[PDB]
């Protein structure tokens, strides 16, 4: 069935971009999607985004800049401490200064640099570059 929906929503977004399509229609539809979209949009790695509110199936329509090369989620969703944020960013990711290791904290979704500033992590949700 449909399980782990978020990974899937990121995965569609990667295929779109590999093709170099203008936009994406996300069939999955959550608070999680929209807060993650807001984080993406502050960095300006995505463009403008629309949420239509339907209760048949909410849709998000996303503009692609093409600045996200790959974005996917974590297989265990294993937890991450504050000291440990760097360890996961070098280890897995090619990034070093791109500043998104997206993590969920008690406030919503944060990036890497944003997690340091607050001082709070949680469970590691995903990554973006």
């Amino acid at each position: 069935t449909l399980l782990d929906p978020l990974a899937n929503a990121l995965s569609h977004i990667t295929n779109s971009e590999r093709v170099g399509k203008r936009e994406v229609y996300i069939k999955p539809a959550s608070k999680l999607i929209g807060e993650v979209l807001r984080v993406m949009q502050k960095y300006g790695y995505i463009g403008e985004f629309e949420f239509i509110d339907d209760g048949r199936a909410g849709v998000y329509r996303v503009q692609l800049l093409g600045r996200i090369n790959k974005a996917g989620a974590i297989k265990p969703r294993f937890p991450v401490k504050v000291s440990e944020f760097e360890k996961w960013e070098k280890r897995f990711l090619p990034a070093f200064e791109f500043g998104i290791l997206i993590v969920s904290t008690s406030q919503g979704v944060m990036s890497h640099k944003e997690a340091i500033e607050k001082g709070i992590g949680g469970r590691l949700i995903a990554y973006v570059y």
């Binding site: 229609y25 239509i52 048949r56 199936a57 849709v59």
Partner: protein, 63 residues
């Protein structure tokens, strides 16, 4: 179909005005079951799969 931006069927509504007793019914355009009059028990439509075959001659106004 219409799956990405609002799922929509093949349907519509029409008002039928009977001539066998003049009762005014709103009817769904894919009869799956026969429709009866509320005052004669007479058949407006007979169903065939998807869109039913319209029995006799009965007027329809398409809303």
């Amino acid at each position: 179909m219409a799956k990405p931006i609002i799922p929509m069927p093949r349907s519509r509504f029409l008002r039928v005005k009977c001539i066998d007793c003049g009762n005014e019914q709103i009817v769904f355009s894919h009869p799956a079951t026969k429709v009866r009059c509320l005052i004669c028990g007479a058949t407006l439509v007979e169903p065939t799969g998807g869109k039913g075959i319209v029995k006799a001659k009965i007027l329809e106004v398409l809303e």
